[PDB]
Amino acid sequence: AMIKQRTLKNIIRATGVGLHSGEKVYLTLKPAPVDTGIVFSRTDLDPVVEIPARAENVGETTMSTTLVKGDVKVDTVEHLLSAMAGLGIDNAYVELSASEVPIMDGSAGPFVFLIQSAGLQEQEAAKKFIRIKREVSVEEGDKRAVFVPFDGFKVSFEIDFDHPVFRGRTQQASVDFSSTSFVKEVSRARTFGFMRDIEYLRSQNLALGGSVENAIVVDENRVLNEDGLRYEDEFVKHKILDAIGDLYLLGNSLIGEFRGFKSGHALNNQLLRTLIADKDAWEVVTFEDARTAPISYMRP
Numbered sequence: 598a599m600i601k602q603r604t605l606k607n608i609i610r611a612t613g614v615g616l617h618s619g620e621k622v623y624l625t626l627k628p629a630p631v632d633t634g635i636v637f638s639r640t641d642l643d644p645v646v647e648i649p650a651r652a653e654n655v656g657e658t659t660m661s662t663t664l665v666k667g668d669v670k671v672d673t674v675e676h677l678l679s680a681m682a683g684l685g686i687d688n689a690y691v692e693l694s695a696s697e698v699p700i701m702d703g704s705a706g707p708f709v710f711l712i713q714s715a716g717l718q719e720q721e722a723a724k725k726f727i728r729i730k731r732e733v734s735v736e737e738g739d740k741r742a743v744f745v746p747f748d749g750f751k752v753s754f755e756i757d758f759d760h761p762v763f764r765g766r767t768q769q770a771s772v773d774f775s776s777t778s779f780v781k782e783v784s785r786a787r788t789f790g791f792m793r794d795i796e797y798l799r800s801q802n803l804a805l806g807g808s809v810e811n812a813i814v815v816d817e818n819r820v821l822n823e824d825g826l827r828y829e830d831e832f833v834k835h836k837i838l839d840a841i842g843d844l845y846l847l848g849n850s851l852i853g854e855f856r857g858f859k860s861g862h863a864l865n866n867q868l869l870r871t872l873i874a875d876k877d878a879w880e881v882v883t884f885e886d887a888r889t890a891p892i893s894y895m896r897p
């Protein structure tokens with residue numbers, strides 16, 4: 598029982614709007630051969646431009662994670678990449694009719710459900726993991742992102758907002774994926790923004806697809822969303838979701854621990870680039886016997 602690479606069993610399609618562009622977009626997830634990785638494809642262009650979901654192709658990291666190849670872009674890939682990492686998808690072609698991945702409901706729930714509705718296929722090649730051997734850290738002002746050696750996969754995150762809805766123990770969370778489910782405890786965490794920031798982004802022709810149906814909107818004192826939150830600590834869980842997605846730009850699942858302190862898409866990519874460059878801090882490992890592996894996946 599070796600831990601095998603996985604792809605999709607069937608093609609699956611979805612429609613949505615880009616959070617920032619507001620453009621209607623058709624998404625197609627397709628099976629892919631062994632060692633392809635996650636590859637984004639702009640099918641609206643002629644010729645079709647393919648962009649591997651790797652750290653080396655990350656462009657602008659202000660609002661969302663963008664993949665670039667030349668002057669062709671694919672915006673906001675993190676929630677989809679978070680779903681693929683959470684379900685152990687090694688190989689897949691992601692086709693898009695526009696430059697931005699659809700926001701859906703702001704979380705990874707709809708992608709996780711679409712991927713599992715199509716089903717997974719174990720392939721005939723061993724799953725490759727990146728094991729953290731030494732600590733790697735990056736800092737920028739009071740922000741920090743760290744990789745720590747750990748026999749499993751764990752993500753810790755802390756946010757720091759001086760605001761009435763962001764107090765208590767809900768500003769920090771730790772998820773150990775050996776005991777906790779990505780689907781149940783992290784996948785449904787929606788993206789969020791403060792109204793003054795959203796107003797600024799809309800004035801710069803950004804956040805155009807944003808709404809209460811795909812984002813948690815917080816004003817100076819409350820959550821404006823009528824139906825409320827899905828988790829008591831939904832905001833820090835969304836940051837954990839973002840980190841899993843950004844970390845998947847390594848190209849393989851991690852055996853280690855991530856700790857983020859006010860970290861974002863920019864600092865997360867800087868942590869990846871430093872890890873990749875410090876080759877003594879990591880190694881590639883496979884598991885011919887799943888009983889000796891510290892990470893476990895759900896049946897395909």
Ligand SMILES: C[C@@H](O)[C@H](NC(=O)c1ccc(C#CC#Cc2ccccc2)cc1)C(=O)NO
Pocket residue numbers: 660661662675788789790795798804807808809812813814835839
């Ligand atoms: C890091 C994380 O925050 C970040 N999210 C955002 O940057 C973000 C930006 C804009 C909006 C929005 C919106 C809206 C709206 C609206 C609602 C009612 C009336 C008018 C507009 C939501 C999230 C994120 O999830 N990146 O992965």
Ligand SMILES: [Zn+2]
Pocket residue numbers: 675676788835839
């Ligand atoms: Zn996000």
